[PDB]
Amino acid sequence: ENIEVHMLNKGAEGAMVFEPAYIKANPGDTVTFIPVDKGHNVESIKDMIPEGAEKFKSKINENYVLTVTQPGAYLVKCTPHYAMGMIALIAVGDSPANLDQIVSAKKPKIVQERLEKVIASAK
Ligand SMILES: [Cu+2]
Numbered sequence: 001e002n003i004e005v006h007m008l009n010k011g012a013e014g015a016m017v018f019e020p021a022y023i024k025a026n027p028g029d030t031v032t033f034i035p036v037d038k039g040h041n042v043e044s045i046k047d048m049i050p051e052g053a054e055k056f057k058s059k060i061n062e063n064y065v066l067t068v069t070q071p072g073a074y075l076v077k078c079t080p081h082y083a084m085g086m087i088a089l090i091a092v093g094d095s096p097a098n099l100d101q102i103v104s105a106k107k108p109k110i111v112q113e114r115l116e117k118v119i120a121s122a123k
Pocket of ligand 1: 007039079
């Protein structure tokens with residue numbers, strides 16, 4: 001199954017966002033990131049993807065198609081806008097084993113704020 005995500009300068013949660021910022025997927029699915037506005041990309045964050053998963057980084061402004069294989073939670077960022085809160089959480093399979101670890105991990109305050117919103121209301 002494919003899930004489309006838009007990379008925008010401004011959206012419902014404020015500036016620099018992925019929409020949706022919570023993606024539910026199964027092994028084998030793809031996530032397509034579309035640069036609706038210029039200046040964005042997607043990058044996996046170190047130690048915030050599951051054991052066994054490969055790290056990934058797209059180029060700025062390219063349409064990028066991610067195939068997800070390993071179950072667990074993945075926190076991805078937009079490289080230039082991580083400090084401004086531009087992240088998304090991909091949850092592959094049920095009860096992702098590493099989710100609490102990702103919620104507790106060191107990250108910028110605005111990122112933590114948006115992450116907690118997406119898990120609460122966006123779940
Ligand atoms: Cu960005």
